[PDB]
PDB file of all heavy atoms in Angstrom:
ATOM      1  N   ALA A   1       3.388   0.839   6.562  1.00  0.00           N
ATOM      2  CA  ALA A   1       4.606   0.034   6.340  1.00  0.00           C
ATOM      3  C   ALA A   1       5.294  -0.266   7.697  1.00  0.00           C
ATOM      4  O   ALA A   1       4.898   0.189   8.728  1.00  0.00           O
ATOM      5  CB  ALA A   1       5.540   0.847   5.450  1.00  0.00           C
ATOM      6  N   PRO A   2       6.385  -1.092   7.602  1.00  0.00           N
ATOM      7  CA  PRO A   2       7.144  -1.483   8.811  1.00  0.00           C
ATOM      8  C   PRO A   2       8.156  -0.455   9.327  1.00  0.00           C
ATOM      9  O   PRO A   2       8.347  -0.325  10.541  1.00  0.00           O
ATOM     10  CB  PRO A   2       7.863  -2.736   8.324  1.00  0.00           C
ATOM     11  CG  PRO A   2       6.975  -3.320   7.339  1.00  0.00           C
ATOM     12  CD  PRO A   2       6.585  -2.088   6.525  1.00  0.00           C
ATOM     13  N   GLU A   3       8.829   0.253   8.410  1.00  0.00           N
ATOM     14  CA  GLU A   3       9.811   1.264   8.847  1.00  0.00           C
ATOM     15  C   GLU A   3       9.082   2.401   9.579  1.00  0.00           C
ATOM     16  O   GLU A   3       9.776   3.324  10.081  1.00  0.00           O
ATOM     17  CB  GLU A   3      10.558   1.787   7.636  1.00  0.00           C
ATOM     18  CG  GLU A   3       9.701   2.342   6.513  1.00  0.00           C
ATOM     19  CD  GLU A   3       9.116   1.264   5.586  1.00  0.00           C
ATOM     20  OE1 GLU A   3       8.899   0.110   6.012  1.00  0.00           O
ATOM     21  OE2 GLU A   3       8.862   1.548   4.385  1.00  0.00           O
ATOM     22  N   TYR A   4       7.745   2.418   9.617  1.00  0.00           N
ATOM     23  CA  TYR A   4       7.034   3.446  10.272  1.00  0.00           C
ATOM     24  C   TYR A   4       6.112   2.953  11.442  1.00  0.00           C
ATOM     25  O   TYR A   4       5.479   3.776  12.113  1.00  0.00           O
ATOM     26  CB  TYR A   4       6.259   4.353   9.273  1.00  0.00           C
ATOM     27  CG  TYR A   4       7.164   5.309   8.460  1.00  0.00           C
ATOM     28  CD1 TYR A   4       7.510   5.012   7.119  1.00  0.00           C
ATOM     29  CD2 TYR A   4       7.675   6.459   9.013  1.00  0.00           C
ATOM     30  CE1 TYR A   4       8.356   5.840   6.403  1.00  0.00           C
ATOM     31  CE2 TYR A   4       8.524   7.307   8.298  1.00  0.00           C
ATOM     32  CZ  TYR A   4       8.888   7.020   7.000  1.00  0.00           C
ATOM     33  OH  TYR A   4       9.720   7.850   6.270  1.00  0.00           O
ATOM     34  N   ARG A   5       5.986   1.646  11.659  1.00  0.00           N
ATOM     35  CA  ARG A   5       5.194   1.132  12.793  1.00  0.00           C
ATOM     36  C   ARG A   5       5.676   1.644  14.143  1.00  0.00           C
ATOM     37  O   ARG A   5       6.864   1.621  14.421  1.00  0.00           O
ATOM     38  CB  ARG A   5       5.172  -0.401  12.778  1.00  0.00           C
ATOM     39  CG  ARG A   5       4.313  -1.033  11.705  1.00  0.00           C
ATOM     40  CD  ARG A   5       4.350  -2.563  11.762  1.00  0.00           C
ATOM     41  NE  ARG A   5       3.680  -3.151  10.565  1.00  0.00           N
ATOM     42  CZ  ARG A   5       2.406  -2.990  10.310  1.00  0.00           C
ATOM     43  NH1 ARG A   5       1.629  -2.281  11.112  1.00  0.00           N
ATOM     44  NH2 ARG A   5       1.900  -3.590   9.245  1.00  0.00           N
ATOM     45  N   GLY A   6       4.773   2.194  14.920  1.00  0.00           N
ATOM     46  CA  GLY A   6       5.062   2.749  16.269  1.00  0.00           C
ATOM     47  C   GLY A   6       5.894   4.036  16.152  1.00  0.00           C
ATOM     48  O   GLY A   6       6.412   4.537  17.188  1.00  0.00           O
ATOM     49  N   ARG A   7       6.031   4.618  14.959  1.00  0.00           N
ATOM     50  CA  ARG A   7       6.821   5.816  14.784  1.00  0.00           C
ATOM     51  C   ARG A   7       6.085   6.943  14.199  1.00  0.00           C
ATOM     52  O   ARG A   7       6.698   7.960  13.846  1.00  0.00           O
ATOM     53  CB  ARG A   7       8.027   5.429  13.885  1.00  0.00           C
ATOM     54  CG  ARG A   7       9.292   6.236  14.225  1.00  0.00           C
ATOM     55  CD  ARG A   7      10.529   5.469  13.681  1.00  0.00           C
ATOM     56  NE  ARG A   7      10.533   5.398  12.230  1.00  0.00           N
ATOM     57  CZ  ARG A   7      10.981   6.345  11.431  1.00  0.00           C
ATOM     58  NH1 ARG A   7      11.333   7.544  11.876  1.00  0.00           N
ATOM     59  NH2 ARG A   7      11.039   6.169  10.092  1.00  0.00           N
ATOM     60  N   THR A   8       4.734   6.811  14.114  1.00  0.00           N
ATOM     61  CA  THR A   8       3.977   7.923  13.567  1.00  0.00           C
ATOM     62  C   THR A   8       2.711   8.202  14.336  1.00  0.00           C
ATOM     63  O   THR A   8       2.141   7.325  15.029  1.00  0.00           O
ATOM     64  CB  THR A   8       3.513   7.630  12.101  1.00  0.00           C
ATOM     65  OG1 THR A   8       2.610   6.473  12.132  1.00  0.00           O
ATOM     66  CG2 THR A   8       4.700   7.242  11.237  1.00  0.00           C
ATOM     67  N   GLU A   9       2.243   9.457  14.207  1.00  0.00           N
ATOM     68  CA  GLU A   9       0.970   9.863  14.800  1.00  0.00           C
ATOM     69  C   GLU A   9       0.349  10.811  13.744  1.00  0.00           C
ATOM     70  O   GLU A   9       1.046  11.436  12.995  1.00  0.00           O
ATOM     71  CB  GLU A   9       1.208  10.681  16.060  1.00  0.00           C
ATOM     72  CG  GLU A   9       1.882   9.855  17.181  1.00  0.00           C
ATOM     73  CD  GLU A   9       2.053  10.689  18.377  1.00  0.00           C
ATOM     74  OE1 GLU A   9       1.152  10.809  19.271  1.00  0.00           O
ATOM     75  OE2 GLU A   9       3.196  11.284  18.502  1.00  0.00           O
ATOM     76  N   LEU A  10      -0.978  10.902  13.773  1.00  0.00           N
ATOM     77  CA  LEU A  10      -1.657  11.862  12.957  1.00  0.00           C
ATOM     78  C   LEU A  10      -2.379  12.753  13.944  1.00  0.00           C
ATOM     79  O   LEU A  10      -3.259  12.276  14.679  1.00  0.00           O
ATOM     80  CB  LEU A  10      -2.669  11.183  11.993  1.00  0.00           C
ATOM     81  CG  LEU A  10      -3.281  12.201  10.999  1.00  0.00           C
ATOM     82  CD1 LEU A  10      -2.238  12.676   9.986  1.00  0.00           C
ATOM     83  CD2 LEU A  10      -4.459  11.574  10.261  1.00  0.00           C
ATOM     84  N   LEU A  11      -1.950  14.009  13.960  1.00  0.00           N
ATOM     85  CA  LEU A  11      -2.539  14.969  14.873  1.00  0.00           C
ATOM     86  C   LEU A  11      -3.890  15.384  14.288  1.00  0.00           C
ATOM     87  O   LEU A  11      -3.928  16.012  13.261  1.00  0.00           O
ATOM     88  CB  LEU A  11      -1.623  16.204  15.022  1.00  0.00           C
ATOM     89  CG  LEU A  11      -0.304  16.040  15.764  1.00  0.00           C
ATOM     90  CD1 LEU A  11       0.535  14.965  15.197  1.00  0.00           C
ATOM     91  CD2 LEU A  11       0.426  17.398  15.793  1.00  0.00           C
ATOM     92  N   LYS A  12      -4.916  15.030  14.999  1.00  0.00           N
ATOM     93  CA  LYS A  12      -6.309  15.272  14.536  1.00  0.00           C
ATOM     94  C   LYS A  12      -7.148  16.261  15.284  1.00  0.00           C
ATOM     95  O   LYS A  12      -8.292  16.483  15.010  1.00  0.00           O
ATOM     96  CB  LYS A  12      -7.047  13.933  14.484  1.00  0.00           C
ATOM     97  CG  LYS A  12      -6.312  12.955  13.524  1.00  0.00           C
ATOM     98  CD  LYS A  12      -7.000  11.551  13.400  1.00  0.00           C
ATOM     99  CE  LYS A  12      -6.745  10.713  14.606  1.00  0.00           C
ATOM    100  NZ  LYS A  12      -5.307  10.245  14.743  1.00  0.00           N
ATOM    101  N   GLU A  13      -6.456  17.054  16.164  1.00  0.00           N
ATOM    102  CA  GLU A  13      -7.229  18.045  16.946  1.00  0.00           C
ATOM    103  C   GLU A  13      -7.966  19.052  16.055  1.00  0.00           C
ATOM    104  O   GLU A  13      -8.997  19.557  16.417  1.00  0.00           O
ATOM    105  CB  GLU A  13      -6.261  18.831  17.865  1.00  0.00           C
ATOM    106  CG  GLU A  13      -6.843  20.172  18.350  1.00  0.00           C
ATOM    107  CD  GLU A  13      -6.098  20.740  19.598  1.00  0.00           C
ATOM    108  OE1 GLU A  13      -4.933  20.369  19.831  1.00  0.00           O
ATOM    109  OE2 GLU A  13      -6.750  21.545  20.301  1.00  0.00           O
ATOM    110  N   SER A  14      -7.437  19.350  14.881  1.00  0.00           N
ATOM    111  CA  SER A  14      -8.091  20.245  13.978  1.00  0.00           C
ATOM    112  C   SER A  14      -8.707  19.623  12.706  1.00  0.00           C
ATOM    113  O   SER A  14      -8.935  20.246  11.716  1.00  0.00           O
ATOM    114  CB  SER A  14      -7.099  21.306  13.498  1.00  0.00           C
ATOM    115  OG  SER A  14      -6.735  22.174  14.553  1.00  0.00           O
ATOM    116  N   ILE A  15      -8.910  18.286  12.756  1.00  0.00           N
ATOM    117  CA  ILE A  15      -9.416  17.622  11.557  1.00  0.00           C
ATOM    118  C   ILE A  15     -10.821  18.094  11.188  1.00  0.00           C
ATOM    119  O   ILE A  15     -11.228  18.015  10.013  1.00  0.00           O
ATOM    120  CB  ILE A  15      -9.314  16.102  11.739  1.00  0.00           C
ATOM    121  CG1 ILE A  15      -9.435  15.411  10.342  1.00  0.00           C
ATOM    122  CG2 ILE A  15     -10.409  15.597  12.723  1.00  0.00           C
ATOM    123  CD1 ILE A  15      -9.086  13.883  10.415  1.00  0.00           C
ATOM    124  N   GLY A  16     -11.537  18.592  12.213  1.00  0.00           N
ATOM    125  CA  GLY A  16     -12.908  19.098  11.930  1.00  0.00           C
ATOM    126  C   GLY A  16     -12.881  20.397  11.110  1.00  0.00           C
ATOM    127  O   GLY A  16     -13.911  20.891  10.605  1.00  0.00           O
ATOM    128  N   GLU A  17     -11.667  20.980  11.004  1.00  0.00           N
ATOM    129  CA  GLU A  17     -11.487  22.173  10.171  1.00  0.00           C
ATOM    130  C   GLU A  17     -10.741  21.851   8.922  1.00  0.00           C
ATOM    131  O   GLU A  17     -10.344  22.714   8.184  1.00  0.00           O
ATOM    132  CB  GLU A  17     -10.632  23.259  10.984  1.00  0.00           C
ATOM    133  CG  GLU A  17     -11.324  23.836  12.247  1.00  0.00           C
ATOM    134  CD  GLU A  17     -10.279  24.553  13.163  1.00  0.00           C
ATOM    135  OE1 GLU A  17      -9.543  25.380  12.646  1.00  0.00           O
ATOM    136  OE2 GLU A  17     -10.224  24.181  14.359  1.00  0.00           O
ATOM    137  N   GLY A  18     -10.484  20.546   8.720  1.00  0.00           N
ATOM    138  CA  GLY A  18      -9.816  20.089   7.468  1.00  0.00           C
ATOM    139  C   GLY A  18      -8.287  20.064   7.583  1.00  0.00           C
ATOM    140  O   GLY A  18      -7.645  19.991   6.572  1.00  0.00           O
ATOM    141  N   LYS A  19      -7.758  20.106   8.756  1.00  0.00           N
ATOM    142  CA  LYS A  19      -6.260  20.145   8.940  1.00  0.00           C
ATOM    143  C   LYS A  19      -5.788  19.036   9.737  1.00  0.00           C
ATOM    144  O   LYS A  19      -6.355  18.636  10.745  1.00  0.00           O
ATOM    145  CB  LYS A  19      -5.963  21.459   9.689  1.00  0.00           C
ATOM    146  CG  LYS A  19      -6.380  22.752   9.057  1.00  0.00           C
ATOM    147  CD  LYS A  19      -5.994  23.901   9.967  1.00  0.00           C
ATOM    148  CE  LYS A  19      -6.417  25.223   9.419  1.00  0.00           C
ATOM    149  NZ  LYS A  19      -6.116  26.245  10.433  1.00  0.00           N
ATOM    150  N   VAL A  20      -4.658  18.488   9.273  1.00  0.00           N
ATOM    151  CA  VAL A  20      -3.979  17.369   9.991  1.00  0.00           C
ATOM    152  C   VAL A  20      -2.472  17.604   9.938  1.00  0.00           C
ATOM    153  O   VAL A  20      -2.010  18.410   9.089  1.00  0.00           O
ATOM    154  CB  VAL A  20      -4.291  15.986   9.423  1.00  0.00           C
ATOM    155  CG1 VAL A  20      -5.853  15.739   9.426  1.00  0.00           C
ATOM    156  CG2 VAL A  20      -3.685  15.824   8.022  1.00  0.00           C
ATOM    157  N   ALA A  21      -1.776  16.854  10.779  1.00  0.00           N
ATOM    158  CA  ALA A  21      -0.292  16.852  10.683  1.00  0.00           C
ATOM    159  C   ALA A  21       0.237  15.481  11.026  1.00  0.00           C
ATOM    160  O   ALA A  21      -0.245  14.833  11.943  1.00  0.00           O
ATOM    161  CB  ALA A  21       0.330  17.864  11.614  1.00  0.00           C
ATOM    162  N   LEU A  22       1.146  14.996  10.209  1.00  0.00           N
ATOM    163  CA  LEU A  22       1.786  13.747  10.474  1.00  0.00           C
ATOM    164  C   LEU A  22       2.970  14.014  11.390  1.00  0.00           C
ATOM    165  O   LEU A  22       3.789  14.880  11.046  1.00  0.00           O
ATOM    166  CB  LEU A  22       2.346  13.135   9.137  1.00  0.00           C
ATOM    167  CG  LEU A  22       3.324  12.034   9.259  1.00  0.00           C
ATOM    168  CD1 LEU A  22       2.608  10.788   9.737  1.00  0.00           C
ATOM    169  CD2 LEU A  22       4.048  11.758   7.940  1.00  0.00           C
ATOM    170  N   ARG A  23       3.113  13.298  12.479  1.00  0.00           N
ATOM    171  CA  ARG A  23       4.288  13.443  13.363  1.00  0.00           C
ATOM    172  C   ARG A  23       5.113  12.187  13.220  1.00  0.00           C
ATOM    173  O   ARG A  23       4.617  11.093  13.394  1.00  0.00           O
ATOM    174  CB  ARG A  23       3.886  13.581  14.800  1.00  0.00           C
ATOM    175  CG  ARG A  23       5.084  13.731  15.705  1.00  0.00           C
ATOM    176  CD  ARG A  23       4.696  13.874  17.185  1.00  0.00           C
ATOM    177  NE  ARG A  23       4.047  15.148  17.485  1.00  0.00           N
ATOM    178  CZ  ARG A  23       3.059  15.275  18.417  1.00  0.00           C
ATOM    179  NH1 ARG A  23       2.629  14.250  19.125  1.00  0.00           N
ATOM    180  NH2 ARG A  23       2.606  16.498  18.637  1.00  0.00           N
ATOM    181  N   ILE A  24       6.353  12.394  12.775  1.00  0.00           N
ATOM    182  CA  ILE A  24       7.354  11.254  12.649  1.00  0.00           C
ATOM    183  C   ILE A  24       8.241  11.372  13.826  1.00  0.00           C
ATOM    184  O   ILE A  24       8.882  12.417  14.074  1.00  0.00           O
ATOM    185  CB  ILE A  24       8.122  11.318  11.347  1.00  0.00           C
ATOM    186  CG1 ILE A  24       7.213  11.388  10.120  1.00  0.00           C
ATOM    187  CG2 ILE A  24       9.072  10.139  11.240  1.00  0.00           C
ATOM    188  CD1 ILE A  24       7.879  11.829   8.844  1.00  0.00           C
ATOM    189  N   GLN A  25       8.336  10.300  14.560  1.00  0.00           N
ATOM    190  CA  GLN A  25       9.212  10.202  15.754  1.00  0.00           C
ATOM    191  C   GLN A  25      10.574   9.698  15.340  1.00  0.00           C
ATOM    192  O   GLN A  25      10.686   8.858  14.443  1.00  0.00           O
ATOM    193  CB  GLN A  25       8.560   9.298  16.807  1.00  0.00           C
ATOM    194  CG  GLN A  25       7.131   9.654  17.119  1.00  0.00           C
ATOM    195  CD  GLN A  25       6.445   8.650  18.004  1.00  0.00           C
ATOM    196  OE1 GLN A  25       6.427   7.471  17.712  1.00  0.00           O
ATOM    197  NE2 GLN A  25       5.858   9.141  19.152  1.00  0.00           N
ATOM    198  N   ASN A  26      11.593  10.074  16.110  1.00  0.00           N
ATOM    199  CA  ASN A  26      12.917   9.567  15.855  1.00  0.00           C
ATOM    200  C   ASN A  26      13.329   9.683  14.409  1.00  0.00           C
ATOM    201  O   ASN A  26      13.729   8.684  13.828  1.00  0.00           O
ATOM    202  CB  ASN A  26      13.023   8.118  16.370  1.00  0.00           C
ATOM    203  CG  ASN A  26      12.590   7.980  17.823  1.00  0.00           C
ATOM    204  OD1 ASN A  26      12.949   8.768  18.701  1.00  0.00           O
ATOM    205  ND2 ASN A  26      11.858   6.921  18.083  1.00  0.00           N
ATOM    206  N   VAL A  27      13.355  10.896  13.956  1.00  0.00           N
ATOM    207  CA  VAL A  27      13.704  11.127  12.560  1.00  0.00           C
ATOM    208  C   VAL A  27      15.138  10.599  12.279  1.00  0.00           C
ATOM    209  O   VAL A  27      16.038  10.748  13.090  1.00  0.00           O
ATOM    210  CB  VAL A  27      13.621  12.632  12.250  1.00  0.00           C
ATOM    211  CG1 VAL A  27      14.272  12.955  10.968  1.00  0.00           C
ATOM    212  CG2 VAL A  27      12.149  13.075  12.220  1.00  0.00           C
ATOM    213  N   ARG A  28      15.299  10.036  11.064  1.00  0.00           N
ATOM    214  CA  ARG A  28      16.606   9.568  10.703  1.00  0.00           C
ATOM    215  C   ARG A  28      16.809   9.934   9.209  1.00  0.00           C
ATOM    216  O   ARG A  28      15.871  10.362   8.530  1.00  0.00           O
ATOM    217  CB  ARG A  28      16.741   8.090  10.919  1.00  0.00           C
ATOM    218  CG  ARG A  28      15.697   7.273  10.234  1.00  0.00           C
ATOM    219  CD  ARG A  28      15.744   5.795  10.693  1.00  0.00           C
ATOM    220  NE  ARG A  28      14.840   4.947   9.986  1.00  0.00           N
ATOM    221  CZ  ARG A  28      13.983   4.088  10.563  1.00  0.00           C
ATOM    222  NH1 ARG A  28      13.932   4.085  11.884  1.00  0.00           N
ATOM    223  NH2 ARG A  28      13.177   3.337   9.845  1.00  0.00           N
ATOM    224  N   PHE A  29      17.996   9.751   8.700  1.00  0.00           N
ATOM    225  CA  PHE A  29      18.204  10.113   7.273  1.00  0.00           C
ATOM    226  C   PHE A  29      17.305   9.416   6.284  1.00  0.00           C
ATOM    227  O   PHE A  29      17.004  10.033   5.229  1.00  0.00           O
ATOM    228  CB  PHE A  29      19.681   9.912   6.872  1.00  0.00           C
ATOM    229  CG  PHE A  29      20.620  11.009   7.290  1.00  0.00           C
ATOM    230  CD1 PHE A  29      21.800  10.704   7.899  1.00  0.00           C
ATOM    231  CD2 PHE A  29      20.320  12.363   7.014  1.00  0.00           C
ATOM    232  CE1 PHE A  29      22.699  11.758   8.237  1.00  0.00           C
ATOM    233  CE2 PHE A  29      21.239  13.388   7.325  1.00  0.00           C
ATOM    234  CZ  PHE A  29      22.382  13.049   7.950  1.00  0.00           C
ATOM    235  N   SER A  30      16.926   8.167   6.533  1.00  0.00           N
ATOM    236  CA  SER A  30      16.014   7.495   5.581  1.00  0.00           C
ATOM    237  C   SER A  30      14.643   8.199   5.497  1.00  0.00           C
ATOM    238  O   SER A  30      13.867   8.012   4.511  1.00  0.00           O
ATOM    239  CB  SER A  30      15.857   6.052   5.897  1.00  0.00           C
ATOM    240  OG  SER A  30      15.274   5.891   7.174  1.00  0.00           O
ATOM    241  N   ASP A  31      14.319   9.012   6.490  1.00  0.00           N
ATOM    242  CA  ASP A  31      13.054   9.757   6.441  1.00  0.00           C
ATOM    243  C   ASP A  31      13.138  10.964   5.557  1.00  0.00           C
ATOM    244  O   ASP A  31      12.103  11.625   5.252  1.00  0.00           O
ATOM    245  CB  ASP A  31      12.621  10.213   7.861  1.00  0.00           C
ATOM    246  CG  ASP A  31      12.381   9.085   8.771  1.00  0.00           C
ATOM    247  OD1 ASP A  31      11.753   8.095   8.375  1.00  0.00           O
ATOM    248  OD2 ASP A  31      12.786   9.152   9.949  1.00  0.00           O
ATOM    249  N   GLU A  32      14.332  11.416   5.190  1.00  0.00           N
ATOM    250  CA  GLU A  32      14.497  12.620   4.406  1.00  0.00           C
ATOM    251  C   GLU A  32      13.876  12.496   3.040  1.00  0.00           C
ATOM    252  O   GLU A  32      13.872  11.384   2.426  1.00  0.00           O
ATOM    253  CB  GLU A  32      15.956  12.975   4.270  1.00  0.00           C
ATOM    254  CG  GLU A  32      16.177  14.358   3.689  1.00  0.00           C
ATOM    255  CD  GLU A  32      17.645  14.790   3.721  1.00  0.00           C
ATOM    256  OE1 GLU A  32      18.519  13.947   3.409  1.00  0.00           O
ATOM    257  OE2 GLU A  32      17.938  15.984   4.007  1.00  0.00           O
ATOM    258  N   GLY A  33      13.283  13.594   2.577  1.00  0.00           N
ATOM    259  CA  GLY A  33      12.698  13.532   1.223  1.00  0.00           C
ATOM    260  C   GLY A  33      11.241  13.863   1.126  1.00  0.00           C
ATOM    261  O   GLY A  33      10.633  14.523   1.947  1.00  0.00           O
ATOM    262  N   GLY A  34      10.693  13.338   0.065  1.00  0.00           N
ATOM    263  CA  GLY A  34       9.253  13.567  -0.240  1.00  0.00           C
ATOM    264  C   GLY A  34       8.277  12.673   0.374  1.00  0.00           C
ATOM    265  O   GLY A  34       8.471  11.502   0.632  1.00  0.00           O
ATOM    266  N   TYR A  35       7.081  13.301   0.690  1.00  0.00           N
ATOM    267  CA  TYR A  35       5.936  12.613   1.234  1.00  0.00           C
ATOM    268  C   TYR A  35       4.728  13.169   0.469  1.00  0.00           C
ATOM    269  O   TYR A  35       4.811  14.235  -0.055  1.00  0.00           O
ATOM    270  CB  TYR A  35       5.708  13.040   2.705  1.00  0.00           C
ATOM    271  CG  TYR A  35       6.745  12.464   3.666  1.00  0.00           C
ATOM    272  CD1 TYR A  35       8.050  12.970   3.692  1.00  0.00           C
ATOM    273  CD2 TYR A  35       6.502  11.361   4.397  1.00  0.00           C
ATOM    274  CE1 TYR A  35       9.024  12.432   4.479  1.00  0.00           C
ATOM    275  CE2 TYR A  35       7.432  10.777   5.242  1.00  0.00           C
ATOM    276  CZ  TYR A  35       8.721  11.315   5.252  1.00  0.00           C
ATOM    277  OH  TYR A  35       9.682  10.741   6.035  1.00  0.00           O
ATOM    278  N   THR A  36       3.714  12.296   0.441  1.00  0.00           N
ATOM    279  CA  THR A  36       2.459  12.709  -0.215  1.00  0.00           C
ATOM    280  C   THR A  36       1.345  12.521   0.817  1.00  0.00           C
ATOM    281  O   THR A  36       1.229  11.487   1.432  1.00  0.00           O
ATOM    282  CB  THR A  36       2.120  11.855  -1.465  1.00  0.00           C
ATOM    283  OG1 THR A  36       3.118  12.024  -2.447  1.00  0.00           O
ATOM    284  CG2 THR A  36       0.745  12.222  -2.013  1.00  0.00           C
ATOM    285  N   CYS A  37       0.576  13.614   1.054  1.00  0.00           N
ATOM    286  CA  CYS A  37      -0.609  13.567   1.943  1.00  0.00           C
ATOM    287  C   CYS A  37      -1.860  13.618   1.056  1.00  0.00           C
ATOM    288  O   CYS A  37      -1.915  14.376   0.045  1.00  0.00           O
ATOM    289  CB  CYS A  37      -0.598  14.797   2.876  1.00  0.00           C
ATOM    290  SG  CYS A  37      -2.259  15.263   3.438  1.00  0.00           S
ATOM    291  N   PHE A  38      -2.822  12.787   1.415  1.00  0.00           N
ATOM    292  CA  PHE A  38      -4.066  12.769   0.635  1.00  0.00           C
ATOM    293  C   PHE A  38      -5.250  12.746   1.535  1.00  0.00           C
ATOM    294  O   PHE A  38      -5.179  12.313   2.690  1.00  0.00           O
ATOM    295  CB  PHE A  38      -4.113  11.574  -0.312  1.00  0.00           C
ATOM    296  CG  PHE A  38      -4.377  10.260   0.365  1.00  0.00           C
ATOM    297  CD1 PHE A  38      -5.623   9.817   0.491  1.00  0.00           C
ATOM    298  CD2 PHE A  38      -3.303   9.427   0.732  1.00  0.00           C
ATOM    299  CE1 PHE A  38      -5.882   8.533   1.094  1.00  0.00           C
ATOM    300  CE2 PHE A  38      -3.504   8.192   1.288  1.00  0.00           C
ATOM    301  CZ  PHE A  38      -4.821   7.725   1.462  1.00  0.00           C
ATOM    302  N   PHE A  39      -6.338  13.272   0.968  1.00  0.00           N
ATOM    303  CA  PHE A  39      -7.658  13.263   1.651  1.00  0.00           C
ATOM    304  C   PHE A  39      -8.614  12.669   0.641  1.00  0.00           C
ATOM    305  O   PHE A  39      -8.641  13.103  -0.534  1.00  0.00           O
ATOM    306  CB  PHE A  39      -8.190  14.692   1.989  1.00  0.00           C
ATOM    307  CG  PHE A  39      -7.508  15.308   3.175  1.00  0.00           C
ATOM    308  CD1 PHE A  39      -6.180  15.838   3.088  1.00  0.00           C
ATOM    309  CD2 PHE A  39      -8.208  15.511   4.339  1.00  0.00           C
ATOM    310  CE1 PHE A  39      -5.616  16.493   4.154  1.00  0.00           C
ATOM    311  CE2 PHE A  39      -7.629  16.227   5.425  1.00  0.00           C
ATOM    312  CZ  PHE A  39      -6.331  16.713   5.276  1.00  0.00           C
TER     313      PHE A  39
END
């Protein structure tokens, strides 16, 4: 989406072990709430 362009990263250093983390930069109130991660 647009509200997240240039504002996210997926940390993949441990993806070979099945683990990832979404990094959201410059957090603001509209970012508050629920997220769904899927594989």
Side-chain angles (χ1 to χ4, degrees):
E3 56 279 26
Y4 286 103
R5 286 178 188 299
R7 211 159 66 80
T8 67
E9 297 179 87
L10 187 69
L11 288 57
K12 301 180 283 291
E13 163 160 22
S14 290
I15 197 168
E17 295 164 54
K19 303 179 181 175
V20 301
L22 166 72
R23 178 181 293 148
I24 303 167
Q25 307 172 307
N26 305 318
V27 168
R28 59 190 183 230
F29 278 133
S30 62
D31 297 316
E32 192 171 40
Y35 289 77
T36 296
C37 154
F38 73 89
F39 286 72

